[PDB]
Amino acid sequence: SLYSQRLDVIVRESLSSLQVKLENTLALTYFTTLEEIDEALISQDIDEESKSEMRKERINIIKNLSNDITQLKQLFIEKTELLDKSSSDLHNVVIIEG
Amino acid sequence: TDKVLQAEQLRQKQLTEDIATKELERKEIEKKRDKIIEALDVIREHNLV
């Protein structure tokens, strides 16, 4: 019962982090910034100051996207292994026989 | 509400069964007095004369 209510807390916190990432990864418009840098590279420019820093800010937004993927990986694998800990509390603490 | 439903249905079912049982009991008591009324009638053979 302790690990079950604890697991329900895990479920609610999982939904919380899921709403976090569905508003940050999915809902936020980093994709439009990527399109904006794509348009600015389509815009003709002195590539000394522009295209170098355009590429650096490409690296920055790709870094932000990788941070989003990192949040996905870290928190979801973490809570999934926490679910597995509760599963070994559940599926691997059983009484049947005597 | 459905648990209350079923609990009170079983409750009043037991109540109805018990009421019918008590009715059977009092009918049996009414059967018991037959011996008494017949005994005091067959004793009743003398009156004032």
Binding site: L15, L26, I62, K73 | -
Partner: protein
């Protein structure tokens, strides 16, 4: 069984992120599993 249904979908999710790391090639391929998990979660919000 319920927890296996749950965490199995997270191994489905780790196989989704196994199919990640498309570095800088295109842009319009991204949020299709994201909206799939979005609508499945919104169903799961209603499944709560």
């Amino acid at each position: 069984v319920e927890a296996e249904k749950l965490s199995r979908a997270w191994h489905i999710f780790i196989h989704e992120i196994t199919a990640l790391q498309g570095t800088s090639l295109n842009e319009v391929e991204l949020s299709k599993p994201l909206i799939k998990q979005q609508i499945y979660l919104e169903s799961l919000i209603k499944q709560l």
